[PDB]
């Protein structure tokens, strides 16, 4: 009997432990449910909830039994429970001194339902008595599931309604939030025949009876819906729908749809038309707005079968799209194809404005056609020279994808496009030879080229690819060569001298410094720490000097003991991901991340102009131009992130630095997350936190827009709009949820107030910037009426403050 010689390991291991001692089963009677339902209707977070949601919460409450002289909660212990007193008396001890005495009906431990907070007073049981109670985890999880199943349920019913079929993913999700649940008991008329109603209804649970002229036509089941046409048109109800058993309906109103989405026909058509236009390689390079304008101004026409829609008698049509039916195309007498639903024709005539229309288009059956005329293109492009404008725009689409040109003013970008010269190359011509100093940026018009270095091939590039952009910013040897790998390769190109006549010092300095810093490789041993520029529980931030290039950087150290202690294992990598991917001028730019036995490193550009927190405090109350500049700058950064499905979640002046030139840099992406569906976790700084985060029913990127309104209020008015005096988190959230927004008598600008009120709208659906148009509604608001957004991005504005000298306070 031999023994095992190789090793088996041992197994290892506050307020929730105590309540387990008092926990007990008890069947909930009618007297209990009604006192819970009463007590929750007066609660801070639960007051907004409907009866079915409060009924669900009431059942998750648990019974706890106490003898006299028993401890419930202790002042200093971490807070986790909320209580409604069922029987007996309970005394409240603050600093070991009796303040109050509570009986049946009263509640305590309110703040636990929002966050883990330290208890203020010690509650003790005077007599023998019992508590109804619920824990945060259970309360938040229940709130999550209620709102989240509601959303997913409603989105399926949106997907089942045919009128929404041509909405995009993002459009369908946005109208899902406009759904309102409406309950009907038996006997109740949902809709009456003859009324001009503007509401779609969808049966989730139950059954209803349909009456036309007081006669039973049919019965409707869970899934059935009615009122699609009521969202498009003013038309009377064809029937009287009456509920037969207790029923629950999801519903969209046209009034809220118009606020959220705009006109439904206009939005639907724009999608149909955008999809049809994108099948052409020409319109594929148009902007979303340009395609939307073509959709809004397109002539739409119904034709009978065997009709000559176009015949070489043409009404200046350049492009044709089939919406319904079929048409046959002819060149003289030869059929060249049949276009069905969604297909289109005319690329040849869109490109060549002056060409005679040689084709014939004959309807095969009854059809609906959209027609884009010569004027419809000119009004879209803003120019009567269509061929030149399409060409100009083709080039613009190429360069707007590059950082170097993306943020230049439209006037500068146009000038630069106009300056493009064209040249041709024989096969085997060295367009660029490595080692030589370049002065030209190229875009390939026609053909192919092959990139090489020290002999070996690296890549192959073709129509609309580009190369050599660095030569515009630097005087340096070309790292690779570019050989022509086709017969008659044509390139557009622009000289450095022309680029320097267009771009001005500030933008040029920004590009010079930025492109260079990522280019230069870095190792830890090459960096010397000059001085510490930031401290905290996270770790430290050092100002560092790179010996080889002499470029100065910033190096954040995140201690490993900090991350593993608070269970932020998965979060530090998601921060690395987000922080590395950001490539916007008003967001901090990462260079590289290093790994270490002690701390996680982040190396970024050095920002020398200090925090915005201090800048506004030097300025005092900001004027209209100054608030426009800073808020405008924050808007561009947040918009960039929202387009990449990132919600920032911690917007405050502290997290915004200023550079040498006085332009903003967003930092600290610790609270930031890649949004996939609805977020529920409670994060951020309480004074800037949106009411939808606090209420636990789901939030998205809209929270950063609330915070924007908080910042604007600080800029114009001075103090915070909510809980300015307050230190207790509970009383801040209370002021955020139910407090009054007021504005000082010295705030004389109507438009400023209007914007602040609309950014600080509690319900997101009514919050400016949160509809389908996104930030467009903020940017076009009267407050920004004289503000050139174009010049902000391109560094062509005088900023409010320029710092004299420097200012400081897988991996």
Ligand X SMILES: CC(C)(C)n1nc(Oc2cccc(Cl)c2)c2c(N)ncnc21
Residues in contact with ligand X by the rule CB under 6 A? 533-534, 541, 554-556, 579, 588, 602, 604-607, 657, 667, 808-809
Pick 129 or 539: Cβ nearer ligand X: 539
Calpha distance 109→667 (Å, rounded):
36
Calpha distance 78→117 (Å, rounded):
6
Alpha-carbon distances of 754 from 465, 474, 610, 784, rounded to whole Å: 46, 47, 31, 12
Q: Is 469 annotated as a binding residue?
A: yes
Considering the complex, what minimum distance in angstroms separates the CB of residue 558 from ligand X? 9
Considering the complex, what minimum distance in angstroms separates the CB of residue 115 from ligand X? 25
Considering the complex, what minimum distance in angstroms separates the CB of residue 603 from ligand X? 7
Breaks in the chain (C–N beyond 2.5 Å) sit after: 6, 13, 312, 809
Q: Are 682 and 696 in contact (CB under 8 A)?
A: yes
Q: Which of 532, 523, 591 is nearest to 557 (CA)?
A: 532
Q: Is 534 annotated as a binding residue?
A: yes
Handedness of CA 459, 460, 466, 470 (dihedral sign): positive
Cβ neighbors of 173 (< 8 A, separation 6 or more) are: 155
Query: Would residue 749 show up in a list of annotated catalytic residues for this protein?
Result: no
Q: Is 537 annotated as a binding residue?
A: yes
Ramachandran region, residue 96 (left: φ > 0; alpha: ψ -120 to 50; beta: rest) = left
Q: Which residues of 243-253 are buried (b: 16+ CB within 10 A; e: fewer)?
A: beeebbbbbbb
Considering the complex, what minimum distance in angstroms separates the CB of residue 612 from ligand X? 11
Q: Is 120 annotated as a binding residue?
A: yes
Classified as helix, coil or strand, 125 is: strand
Pick 438 or 670: Cβ nearer ligand X: 670
Considering the complex, what minimum distance in angstroms separates the CB of residue 803 from ligand X? 12
Cβ neighbours around 405 below 10 Å, total:
21
Pick 555 or 712: Cβ nearer ligand X: 555
Pick 544 or 675: Cβ nearer ligand X: 544
- Kind of pairing between the strands at 327-331 and 359-363: antiparallel
Q: Are 759 and 706 in contact (CB under 8 A)?
A: yes
Q: What is the DSSP letter of 787?
A: -
Pick 77 or 526: Cβ nearer ligand X: 526
Considering the complex, what minimum distance in angstroms separates the CB of residue 658 from ligand X? 10
Q: Is 436 annotated as a binding residue?
A: no
Q: Which residue is nearest to ligand X (CB)?
A: 534
Considering the complex, what minimum distance in angstroms separates the CB of residue 601 from ligand X? 8
Considering the complex, what minimum distance in angstroms separates the CB of residue 775 from ligand X? 25
Classified as helix, coil or strand, 331 is: strand
Q: Is 404 annotated as a binding residue?
A: no
Q: Is 238 annotated as a binding residue?
A: no
Q: Which of 271, 266, 259, 252 is nearest to 176 (CA)?
A: 252
Considering the complex, what minimum distance in angstroms separates the CB of residue 539 from ligand X? 10
Q: Is 260 annotated as a binding residue?
A: no
Q: Is 100 annotated as a binding residue?
A: yes
Cβ neighbors of 798 (< 8 A, separation 6 or more) are: none
- The angle that helices 51-60 and 136-160 make with each other, rounded to 10 degrees, is 140
Pick 315 or 535: Cβ nearer ligand X: 535
Question: Which residue out of 293, 650, 704, 735 is catalytically annotated?
Answer: 650
Q: Is 556 annotated as a binding residue?
A: yes
Q: Is 459 annotated as a binding residue?
A: yes
Considering the complex, what minimum distance in angstroms separates the CB of residue 607 from ligand X? 4
Calpha distance 540→552 (Å, rounded):
17
Tokens of 720: 């915070």
Pick 254 or 665: Cβ nearer ligand X: 665
CB neighbour class for 230 (10 Å; exposed up to 12, middle 13-18, buried from 19): buried
Q: Is 314 annotated as a binding residue?
A: no
Cβ neighbours around 737 below 10 Å, total:
17
Q: What are phi and psi of 764, to 5 degrees?
A: -60, -30
Q: Is 240 annotated as a binding residue?
A: no
Cβ neighbours around 455 below 10 Å, total:
6
Pick 534 or 718: Cβ nearer ligand X: 534
Pick 667 or 689: Cβ nearer ligand X: 667
- Kind of pairing between the strands at 430-432 and 481-484: antiparallel
Q: Is 538 annotated as a binding residue?
A: yes
Q: Where would I find the beta strands (DSSP E) of 304-357? A: 308-311, 317-324, 327-331, 334-339, 344-345
Considering the complex, what minimum distance in angstroms separates the CB of residue 801 from ligand X? 16
Calpha distance 159→453 (Å, rounded):
54
SS (HEC) of 521-548 = CCCHHHEEEEEEEEECCCEEEEEEEECC
Q: Which of 689, 618, 622 is nearest to 652 (CA)?
A: 689
Q: Where are the alpha helices (DSSP H) in 61-112?
A: none
Q: Which of 22, 101, 90 is nearest to 62 (CA)?
A: 22
How is the chain split among helix, strand and coil, in percent rounded to 5? 35, 25, 40
Q: Are 231 and 264 in contact (CB under 8 A)?
A: yes
Q: Is 478 annotated as a binding residue?
A: yes
Pick 412 or 604: Cβ nearer ligand X: 604
Pick 277 or 588: Cβ nearer ligand X: 588
CB neighbour class for 435 (10 Å; exposed up to 12, middle 13-18, buried from 19): exposed
Q: Are 205 and 248 in contact (CB under 8 A)?
A: yes
Pick 211 or 594: Cβ nearer ligand X: 594
Considering the complex, what minimum distance in angstroms separates the CB of residue 637 from ligand X? 14
Q: Which residues are annotated as a binding site?
A: 100, 109-110, 112, 119-120, 459, 468-469, 471, 478-479, 533-541, 556
Q: Which residues are annotated as a binding site for ATP?
A: 533-541, 556
Q: Which amino acids are annotated catalytic?
A: 650
Q: Which residues are annotated as a binding site for 3',5'-cyclic GMP?
A: 100, 109-110, 112, 119-120, 459, 468-469, 471, 478-479
């Amino acid at each position: 009997g031999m023994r095992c010689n190789e090793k088996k390991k041992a197994i290892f291991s506050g307020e929730d432990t105590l309540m387990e001692d008092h926990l007990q089963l008890r069947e909930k009677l009618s007297e209990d449910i009604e006192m819970i339902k009463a007590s929750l209707k007066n609660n801070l977070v639960c007051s907004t909830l409907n009866d079915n949601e409060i009924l669900t919460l009431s059942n998750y409450m648990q019974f706890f039994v106490f003898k006299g002289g028993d401890l419930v909660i202790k002042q200093g212990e971490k807070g986790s429970y909320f209580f409604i007193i069922n029987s007996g008396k309970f005394d409240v001890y603050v600093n070991d001194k009796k303040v109050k005495s509570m009986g049946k009906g009263s509640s305590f431990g309110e703040a636990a339902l929002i966050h883990n907070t330290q208890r203020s007073a010690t509650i003790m049981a005077e007599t023998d008595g019992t508590l109804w109670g619920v824990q945060r985890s259970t309360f938040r999880a229940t709130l999550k599931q209620l709102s989240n199943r509601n959303f997913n349920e409603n989105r399926s019913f949106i997907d089942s309604v045919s009128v929404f079929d041509m909405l995009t993913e993002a459009q369908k999700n946005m109208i899902t939030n406009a759904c309102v649940i409406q309950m009907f008991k038996p006997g109740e008329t949902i809709v009456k025949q003859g009324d001009y109603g503007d509401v779609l209804f969808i049966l989730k649970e139950g059954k209803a009876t349909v009456f036309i002229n007081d006669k039973e036509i049919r019965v409707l089941n869970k899934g059935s819906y009615f009122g699609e046409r009521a969202l498009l048109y003013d038309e009377p109800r064809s029937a009287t729908i009456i509920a037969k058993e207790p029923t629950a309906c999801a519903s969209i109103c046209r009034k809220l749809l118009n606020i959220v989405l705009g006109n439904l026909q206009v939005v639907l058509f724009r999608n149909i038309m955008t999809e049809a236009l994108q099948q052409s390689e020409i319109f594929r390079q148009f902007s979303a707005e340009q395609l939307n304008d073509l959709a809004d101004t397109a002539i739409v026409r119904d034709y009978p079968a065997n009709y000559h829609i176009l015949h070489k008698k043409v009404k200046s049509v350049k492009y044709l799209i089939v919406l319904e039916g079929k048409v046959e195309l002819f060149l003289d007498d030869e059929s060249i194809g049949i276009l069905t639903r969604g297909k289109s024709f005319g690329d040849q005539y869109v490109l060549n404005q002056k060409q005679k229309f040689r084709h014939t288009v004959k309807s095969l059956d009854v059809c609906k056609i959209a027609l884009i005329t010569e004027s419809c293109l000119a009004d879209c492009l803003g120019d009567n020279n269509i061929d030149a404008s399409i060409d100009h725009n083709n080039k613009k689409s190429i360069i707007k994808k590059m950082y170097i040109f993306r943020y230049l003013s439209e006037q500068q970008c146009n000038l630069l496009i106009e300056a493009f010269r064209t040249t041709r190359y024989e096969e085997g011509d060295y367009i660029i030879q490595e080692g030589e100093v370049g002065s030209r940026f190229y875009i390939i018009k026609n053909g192919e080229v092959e990139v090489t270095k020290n002999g070996k091939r690296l890549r192959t590039l073709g129509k609309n690819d580009y190369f050599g952009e660095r030569a515009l910013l630097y005087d340096e040897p070309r790292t690779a060569s570019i050989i022509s790998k086709a017969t008659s390769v044509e390139c557009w190109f622009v000289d450095k001298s022309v680029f320097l006549q267009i771009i001005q010092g500030p933008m040029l300095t920004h590009l010079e410094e930025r492109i260079k810093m990522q280019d230069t490789k870095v190792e830890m041993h090459e960096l010397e720490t000059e001085r510490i520029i930031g401290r905290g529980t996270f770790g430290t931030v050092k100002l560092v000097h790179h010996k080889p290039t002499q470029i100065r950087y910033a190096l954040k150290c995140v201690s490993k003991r900090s991350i593993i202690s608070l269970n932020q294992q998965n979060n530090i990598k998601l921060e690395r991901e987000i922080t590395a991917e950001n490539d916007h001028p008003f967001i901090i730019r990462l260079v590289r991340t290093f790994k270490d036995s002690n701390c996680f490193y982040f190396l970024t550009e050095l920002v020398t102009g200090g925090e915005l927190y201090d800048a506004i405090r030097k300025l005092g109350l900001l004027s209209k131009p100054q608030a426009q500049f800073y808020l405008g700058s924050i808007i561009l950064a947040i918009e960039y992130l929202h387009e990449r499905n990132i919600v920032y979640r911690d917007l405050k002046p502290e997290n915004i630095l200023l550079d040498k030139q006085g332009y903003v840099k967003l930092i600290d992406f610790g609270c930031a997350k890649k949004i996939q569906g609805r977020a529920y976790t409670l994060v951020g700084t309480p004074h800037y936190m949106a009411p939808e985060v606090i209420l636990g029913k789901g939030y998205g990127c809209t929270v950063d827009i609330w915070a924007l309104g908080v910042c604007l209020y600080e800029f114009i008015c001075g103090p915070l709009p909510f809980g300015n005096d307050q230190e207790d988190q509970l009383e801040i959230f209370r002021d955020i949820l139910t407090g009054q927004l007021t504005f000082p008598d010295y705030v004389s600008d109507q438009d400023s107030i209007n914007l602040m009120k609309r950014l600080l709208c509690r319900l997101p659906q009514g919050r400016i910037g949160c509809s389908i148009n996104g930030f467009k509604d903020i940017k076009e608001h009267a407050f920004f009426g004289n503000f050139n957004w174009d010049k902000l991005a391109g560094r062509l504005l005088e900023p409010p403050l320029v710092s004299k000298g420097e200012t400081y306070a897988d991996f």
